[PDB]
Structure 1
Amino acid sequence: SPNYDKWEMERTDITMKHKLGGGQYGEVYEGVWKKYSLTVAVKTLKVEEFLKEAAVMKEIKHPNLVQLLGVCTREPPFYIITEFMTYGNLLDYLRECNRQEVSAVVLLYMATQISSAMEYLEKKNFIHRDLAARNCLVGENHLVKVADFGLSRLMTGDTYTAHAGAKFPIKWTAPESLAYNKFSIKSDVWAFGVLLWEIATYGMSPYPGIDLSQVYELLEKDYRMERPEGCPEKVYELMRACWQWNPSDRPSFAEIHQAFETMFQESSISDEVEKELGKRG
């Protein structure tokens, strides 16, 4: 039919149950797709930034990107409707987890899943622009997905320049981005370095006790966050690669993913055996 749009759903298909989290996600609701009795998440507005996130999510698809199910953007109130991620945002997940469940191998699994998604965006020539643990979502069996695509975009040049007044979450933001509003897949890699550090610390805040106003100056003097207690030497080396001052010196997400894939696989082996010991009590 002439007005068919594969993504546009009817608002009345969705029951809005309650606002998720603690207003901490803004206007994101747990809903039900009543036809199917499926729990969904729904972000609502009542614009350009909203519609831009809606547009971007139609273009990207991956096992580790939160899955768009549909939108209601023909008339207000606008909706973006996605799968429901059962455990919420990764930062709080890490802060409250049982570390016998969320063990060294699961920390590697998490980094493998996120870098898998970013390797995909990387070859799609997208940038994400807001990589952080608070912006990843967790499902069953430590399934992790990247979310929050409001600043994501398909790249036309090597660099995107955010508008003059823009402000950024300073502790995740690469030097060139802080100083010159320049973004690229490489400033995503820098933010991924910080995300790695959030994972390794089970969700500590970065640069603890360092004033936001001091951060760029410290970076320019080559200060970088210390290796967290318990963090594998190789993981920390990858963090430091992600935090190379010059963007072209940072690894690709292709390289990053491959390295974490390998480390994950090795760690799984010992984990699986340790599980089977212990079941033989």
Structure 2
Amino acid sequence: PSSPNYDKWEMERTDITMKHKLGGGQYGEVYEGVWKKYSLTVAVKTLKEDTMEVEEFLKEAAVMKEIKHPNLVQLLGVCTREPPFYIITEFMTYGNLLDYLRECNRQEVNAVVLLYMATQISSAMEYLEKKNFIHRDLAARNCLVGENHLVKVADFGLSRLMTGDTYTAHAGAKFPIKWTAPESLAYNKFSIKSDVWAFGVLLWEIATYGMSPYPGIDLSQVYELLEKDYRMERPEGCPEKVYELMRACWQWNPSDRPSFAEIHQAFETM
């Protein structure tokens, strides 16, 4: 603290022991680490080369210092002095939520756990809304599961890392089409209300244990279908009030969609 200039986030590289990369590789340069002096497992995001990709890294770190919520990824410290630069967060032990849902025992991860996981996310988004932060890529793949069904919303920059049809072209721009609000597809602008759309698809994800949205529909077909008022059907075993919440998040006009504050209230009140 005595230091005049000072940064409470900056700390010692040699405190962290870096293990192998996470999620094999399809989540980018994010590593398992141990912060030995605390016996804490961590997730470390590094930056190689001299590069001027450096600007983004420092944006990310500056965003994360602002964000403080039990259901949002939490910055534990950084290393910016010398290469590689490090962003350090707590390791969520069960990995991403999509795979967690797909690979889980449904008796242990039963319907109340699903609804508890959904309430955690809605609460995270309530906080972000209050902060006026637009997430832009909300999806199970960007949520993380920790101990005892703790869920945290993150953003792994997955549009530049995932191969396949998750991120695709629509009218000459790139989108995770299945999570994308119609006005975002058509006008390439985003809002908290477009995150609300994403939230409704994420709900459907949770409710189906990680099925790919719009089954039976060709991707080139979703905009036209949404415009004709097609929406996904209620998943098997999904609570009536949860499906109604989905259908509200998927109102054509952004102004008819609930706020996240309202979405959380629906969870409290259901």
Q: For residues 210-237 of structure 1, what are the alpha-carbon distances to aligned partners after superposition, in whole Å with 9 as ceiling and x for unaligned?
A: 2222211111111111111111111111
Q: How far does residue 77 in structure 1 lie from its aligned partner after superposition?
A: 1.6
Identical-residue share of aligned pairs (%) = 100
* Residue 166 (structure 1) shift: 5.1
* TM-fit CA distance, 1:36: 1.9
Unaligned runs of 5+ in 2: 49-53
How far did residue 209 of structure 1 move? 3.4
- 1:3 Cα deviation after fit: 3.4
Offset, 1:67: 1.3
Q: Which runs of 4+ in 1 moved over 4 A?
A: 149-166
SS in 2 for 1:109: helix
1:137 corresponds, among 144, 151, 159, to 144
1:48 positional shift: 2.8
Q: Does the 8 A contact of 1:159 with 1:182 survive in 2?
A: no
What's the TM-score, normalizing by structure 2? Answer: 0.89
What is the CA distance between 1:141 and its match in structure 2?
A: 1.2
Distance 1:3 1:195, change over 3 A: same
Cα distance change of structure 1 residues 153 and 99 upon mapping to structure 2, 3 Å threshold: closer
Give the Cα–Cα distance (whole angstroms) in 2 for the partners of residues 141 and 252 of structure 1: 28
Contact 2:168 2:174 (8 Å CA) reproduced: no
- Separation of aligned partners in 1, 2:242 and 2:221: 26
Aligned to 1:83: 90
1:149/1:51 CA distance change after superposition, 3 Å: farther
Structure 1 residue runs of 5 or longer lacking an equivalent are 264-281
| Aligned-partner Cα distance in 1 for 2:181–2:254 | 9
Please tell me whether the aligned partners of residues 159 and 167 of structure 2 are also in contact (alpha carbons under 8 angstroms). no
Deviation of 1:21 after TM superposition, in Å, equals 1.7
The question of whether the paired residues in 1 share the 8 Å contact of 2:76 and 2:88 is answered with yes
Structure 2 CA distance, aligned partners of 1:159 and 1:228? 21
Deviation by residue 1:216-271 (Cα, 9 ceiling, x = unmatched):
111111111111111111111110100011101100111111112334xxxxxxxx
Q: Which moved more, 1:187-196 or 1:154-163?
A: 154-163
How far apart, in 2, do the equivalents of 1:158 and 1:216 lie? 16
Instruction: Compute the displacement of 1:92 (Å).
Output: 0.6
C-alpha separation in 1, matches of 2:66 and 2:167: 19
Q: Count residues in correspondence.
A: 263
For 1:132 and 1:157, the matched residues in 2 are separated by 16
1:230 and 1:211 mapped to 2: Cα distance? 25
TM-superposed CA distance for 1:143, in Å, is 0.8
8 Å CA contact 2:170–2:177 kept in 1: the answer is no
TM-score by length of 1: 0.85
Shift in CA distance, 247/144, structure 1 to aligned 2, threshold 3 Å: same
